[PDB]
Design a binder for this molecule. Structure first.
Ligand SMILES: O=C(O)C[C@H](NC(=O)CP(=O)(O)O)C(=O)O
Ligand SMILES: O=C(O)C[C@H](NC(=O)CP(=O)(O)O)C(=O)O
Ligand SMILES: O=C1C[C@@H](C(=O)O)NC(=O)N1
Ligand SMILES: O=C1C[C@@H](C(=O)O)NC(=O)N1
Ligand SMILES: [Ba+2]
Ligand SMILES: [Ba+2]
Ligand SMILES: [Ba+2]
Ligand SMILES: [Zn+2]
Ligand SMILES: [Zn+2]
Lengths: 291, 422, 291, 422
């Protein structure tokens, strides 16, 4: 009966198990889980919320949606008390996305009779996205071992990076980061990463590049002089398209900031593939947590 | 209480280069004689056989939370902690509510501390009115009422002329500025900017925030002639900068929170919000540099920055109040350095007694004849656990909660009166 | 085919009937009602909305959710016209929560071919919560007759008090109130209540204490000098915990305002029990109104 | 001090309908026996022959200016004035700086008053935070710390719900509101709206400003069940309104400043700014009505509104701080009414003792067996002059400065201890 709060808590075996279910679901496996899930979102979401929702429903899980600013959070109900409320209401799963870092989480998880699934907690973790990104990379290449995976952009504020990098590392991939030096953590090498000052070197090095969106709503000061200059320095431009081998973006894309307006859906883009992998990976997670 | 004798203990008084097995006679709250086997008719006796006898410890950095946050701690609970930890004198910080920026708050504290009657509580004033950082506080009235120093702890002063003016007006009055060094543009997150912030995505506080203000303060101290005391030093570069100004004859002193000697940022992963503190716990290299700064005499004293917060203020790191309690754990924590042969016992005592006394300009931290009979008696080897049975703080916020400590106070004596015993 | 707008409209027999169904549902009774319900919330809610929703779904009722500020209320559609819209759309039930007092209501109820269920109307009524509180008290003690039930806090603004007190009274319970004198209605004795100036006397008197949240979003001026002082004067503090026999809170709790941070889920607290009773009581209400 | 006897005086204790020539035995600060010619082995004796012996006077309206305006007066100087005037208990107003709207200021005053050790000083709290008139103050914390009433003196409360809420929360706590009644739209000038304002063109304060708020307070007291105490009543209509609410059983009490019994607005022409006071000195008809209200029992007590200001704050009327000192002159001023046969001596004592005690709900103003030995001993006929030789206030601001007074305290006793003698 467990929870998935952080990629850092998954063993190799657990990832193999999840991704095996995900592949099975992608190939059309049906399965019924008689459960209910409440999806508690106090940050915006399109794909993460809808894929968790649709994944649940296709498994027979009844889904309930609560957005933070309509919930009794507005009356001062703490995060813990909200989850405890979900527990009293008989929910089996709680899929949550919140604007703060949920750390420490272990004692709270342990104290609840609930299957908690982190759909994003501030700048901290988004484990299902890391799983989707790993699965997407693996589906493309066969294995991730020794692959060179470059993340570009706002690393500092990225729960997508923090969920994906450890999983890739754990299976022998090599991670690189490139972005405005103001948005690269000083001790980013805690993820065993190479740092590229220059995105063109990073792109030549990379087997796959994951562009990340500027987390403007999370940034406590201005970190970059401008979006169009950022695009020239770091973005997937038309010139860079010739050289890029393959690329990803967890979404949503900011066109002409991250990726050129014309380059979102090319034969080199796995972006739509990440979307399509959302439901099977998120089904795999409900299943993996069903005891 | 006319006469007391502390018998058979191992006396250490670094202020006088005095050590050996001596007895101490106390008459009317004062040190009367120190000699081999003293005996007087109708005297109180405490037997210090097998124990260390030294001046009462002085902690120049304590949060009593009184007025205004007394659910965290108050003058009574903090004073009990102090004396249970070997402290006969503490300096309380002015970030109370209301803050210590007027003589009413000073007097309230002085009077309440007298009523409590366990250790001497010496107030500080704020550097700025309301501690808002904009206008210098009334140093003249605050000193006259009994303040011994000015600080905006735990807020930095961001305007350089404000800090310069503080230093000028304080030195004119003969008192130091204690500065909480953390530039607020570079230190507005929750933990160190290091491995743990990178790994978890918690907002961070850059070591340069501390370094830049320490460097600023050394320069200001140099040019004004004022004395600046740097609170809770936490990085290697910081110590380098301090030493650079000490080398020039600048009146700059500093202290270390023993927690920074024991823990790194990694402690955030083991103790969660009870490792959230400003300045943060930083890296191994910083921890080791601090110990080296203690060894080499760059760090002038230990001071706890005893900063109690309730358990509900120590849950998710992001929302947690920063601070660690430390009055009861300072001595065993320090004794860890003694056990590793990093410092001598005399040196450890210096850092708790005469050094902090000299920083705040009080004639304490001594067993000189005629001086107040503030005496601490301790067992460097006695094991205990900080827990519900043993904690005198209203709060529990320390990564040493529930862990085995070695080194413990057996007696604390203040003006010849036993105010604490094991 | 009726509605439940106010506790004041329930006879003894009706309450016995509802609570009998609630007990049956709590003990696992299944039942199908082929209906649809629209849940129309123009105030925040977590537990009330989710328990009405989950209650409906477990009975086979299709549920539809409308939050006020996304609805055509924003284009000027009046409350009545919204309900009439629900009627044209074929809803069987309308569960509504609104920021104003729905009084008078009888003529409007009578004119609609709908089963209206008041999930909270301003400071007026919240009948399902009064039923849940009564049921929770009854499940604990066996009967409510001659029990001493103390409500603490913002009585003046409390639809929870106004729904619970009449039901308890009707079955012979004794109601007491204690709170800031500025938040006790002058003619509170219209509920046959004793008034305690002092919460410690109230707590010694009470068999059960229901803490109420300060209705800050309803208060038209400041009524109390501070939240921490309110907590000292009226809150369930650690010192009071030794003396309190039993306690409740309709939720959400404001920790260290109503109830000490450590005292929300103790062996003396029925708070979680109120949450767990939500669904069975709200099922009972749908059933009670199904003709 | 185990035993004291007050011998041969004329005792008057209106609380007990007790009068005659009796001795009083005091044991351990308390009243032990009251009887003809008491004699005990090894007793302290003060001879009260030819003098009046009664409970210590209680003044429920005093400005101690402490904290924040101690150049005007402080707790020490005001306490000396109090006891020299026959007062063993005073209630201090909360318009200090900082104002008494938190427990730190309350405690400072309580502790300082204990150190001074002459009379019991009972603090009040403000009605509103900062006395700014907008938000109710924390009554619960202030009462718990020792406040006996709430007032925004010397500012009126202008919002009616604020006043209603004050009355509600105070009555819930069992304490009164003391209201400074002067509507600020009708009372923003400097002297009464009467002959002198008309003649000189000084800005004025309308009697209706006072009347309208007293009427408001009676209604609020009636409907809330709270107790409102009207400070410094100054007009005929005011007394009529008060009596109208007293007749209905409303908990409304009031006081008169003895200066308003002695002086009219005309005093502004003779004493200049030392006659500037809020509420102002008004007309002859008002003065006489006040005396009549004292006679008929409408005015419940005398209370000085001792309000010291320095001489440089008492120059041009327009710029002068309002207020008159009065602690040392209250008794001879009151005795003027006794001499004219307007009130009995018993009645005069009631107004200084049991009546003010009952208003603030303290068990004082009595010589009941077992109660604190607060005793005042005075000569109704002894002449003296308030001047530099005799003034204990730091300030001099009273039209009685330098004038002959008749009636004077010979002894003041507080908890069995002589704290004042002539
Ligand atoms: O928002 C991003 O930049 C990446 C990532 N995005 C998503 O999960 C997609 P969505 O917000 O549409 O669910 C996230 O961290 O929320
Ligand atoms: O909000 C309260 O204080 C009590 C009561 N609360 C509830 O119904 C719980 P919720 O708002 O989470 O549905 C209400 O009146 O809405
Ligand atoms: O600067 C400070 C102040 C302190 C407090 O809680 O007062 N706690 C800290 O950790 N750092
Ligand atoms: O209302 C007041 C307050 C007082 C003061 O000086 O405090 N002086 C006055 O004359 N009237
Ligand atoms: Ba695991
Ligand atoms: Ba009916
Ligand atoms: Ba919305
Ligand atoms: Zn500090
Ligand atoms: Zn006054």
């Amino acid at each position: 009966m467990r929870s998935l709060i952080s990629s850092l808590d998954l063993t190799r075996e657990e990832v193999e198990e999840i991704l095996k279910y995900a592949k099975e679901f992608k190939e059309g496996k049906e399965e019924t889980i008689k459960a209910s899930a409440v999806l508690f979102f106090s940050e915006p979401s399109t794909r993460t919320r809808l894929s968790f929702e649709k994944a649940a429903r296709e498994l027979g899980i009844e889904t309930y949606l609560v957005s933070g600013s309509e919930s009794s959070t507005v009356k001062g109900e703490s995060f813990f008390d909200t989850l405890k409320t979900f527990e009293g209401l008989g929910f089996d799963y709680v899929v949550f996305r919140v604007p703060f870092v949920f750390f420490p989480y272990k004692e709270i998880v342990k104290s609840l009779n609930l299957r908690l699934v982190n759909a994003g907690d501030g700048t901290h973790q988004h484990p299902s996205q890391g799983l989707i990104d790993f699965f997407t990379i693996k589906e493309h290449f066969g294995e991730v071992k020794d692959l060179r995976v470059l993340y570009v952009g706002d690393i500092k504020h990225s729960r997508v990076f923090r969920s994906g990098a450890p999983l890739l590392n754990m299976f022998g991939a090599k991670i690189g980061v490139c972005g405005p030096k103001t948005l690269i953590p000083r001790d980013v090498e805690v993820f065993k990463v190479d740092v590229f000052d220059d995105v063109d070197k990073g792109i030549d090095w990379a087997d796959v590049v994951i562009w990340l969106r500027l987390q403007k709503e999370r940034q406590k000061e201005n970190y970059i002089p401008s979006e169009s200059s950022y695009f020239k320095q770091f973005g997937l431009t038309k010139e860079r398209f010739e050289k890029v081998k393959l690329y990803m973006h967890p979404g949503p894309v900011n066109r002409n900031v991250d990726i050129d307006h014309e380059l979102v859906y090319t034969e080199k883009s796995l972006i739509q593939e990440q979307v399509k992998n959302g439901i099977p990976v998120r089904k795999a997670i409900y299943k993996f947590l069903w005891t | 209480m006319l006469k007391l004798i502390v018998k058979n203990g191992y006396v250490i008084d670094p202020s006088q280069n005095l050590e050996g097995e001596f007895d101490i006679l106390v008459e009317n709250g004062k040190i009367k004689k120190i000699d081999k086997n003293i005996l007087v008719p109708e005297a109180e006796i405490i037997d210090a056989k097998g124990l260390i006898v030294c001046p009462g410890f002085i902690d120049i950095h304590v949060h009593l939370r009184d007025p205004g946050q007394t659910y965290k701690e108050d003058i009574e609970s903090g004073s009990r902690c102090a004396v249970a930890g070997g402290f006969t004198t503490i300096v309380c910080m002015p970030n109370t509510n209301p803050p210590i920026d007027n003589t009413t708050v000073v007097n309230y504290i002085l009077q309440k501390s007298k009523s409590v009657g366990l250790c001497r509580v010496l107030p500080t004033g704020t550097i700025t009115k309301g501690r808002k950082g904009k206008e210098i506080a009334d140093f003249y009235s605050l000193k006259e009422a009994g303040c011994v120093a000015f600080t905006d702890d735990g807020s930095p002063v961001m305007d350089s002329s404000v800090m310069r003016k503080a230093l000028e007006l304080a030195s004119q009055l003969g008192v130091p500025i204690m500065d909480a060094c953390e530039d607020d543009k570079l230190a507005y997150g929750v933990i160190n900017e290091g491995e743990v912030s990178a790994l978890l995505g918690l907002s961070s506080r850059a070591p340069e925030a501390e370094e830049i203000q320490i460097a600023r303060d050394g320069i200001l101290a140099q040019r004004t002639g004022g004395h600046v005391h740097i609170q809770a030093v936490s990085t290697k570069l910081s110590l380098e900068i301090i030493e650079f100004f000490k080398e020039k004859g600048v009146k700059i002193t500093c202290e270390v929170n023993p927690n920074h000697l024991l823990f790194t940022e990694r402690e955030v992963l083991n103790s969660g919000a009870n490792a959230r503190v400003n300045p943060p716990l930083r890296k191994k290299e910083d921890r080791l540099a601090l110990i080296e700064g203690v060894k080499r005499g760059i760090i002038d004293c230990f001071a706890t920055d005893h900063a109690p917060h309730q358990t509900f203020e120590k849950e998710l790191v992001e929302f947690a109040m920063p601070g660690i309690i430390g009055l009861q754990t300072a001595l065993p924590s320090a004794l860890e350095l003694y056990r590793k042969g990093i410092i001598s016992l005399k040196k450890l005592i210096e850092m708790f007694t005469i050094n902090p006394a000299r920083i705040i300009g009080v004639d304490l931290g001594t067993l000189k004849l005629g001086s107040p009979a503030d005496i601490t008696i301790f067992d460097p080897n006695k094991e205990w656990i900080l827990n519900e049975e043993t904690n005198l703080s209203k709060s529990r916020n320390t990564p040493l909660w529930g862990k085995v400590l070695k080194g413990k106070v057996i007696y604390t004596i203040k003006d010849g009166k036993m105010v604490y015993k094991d």
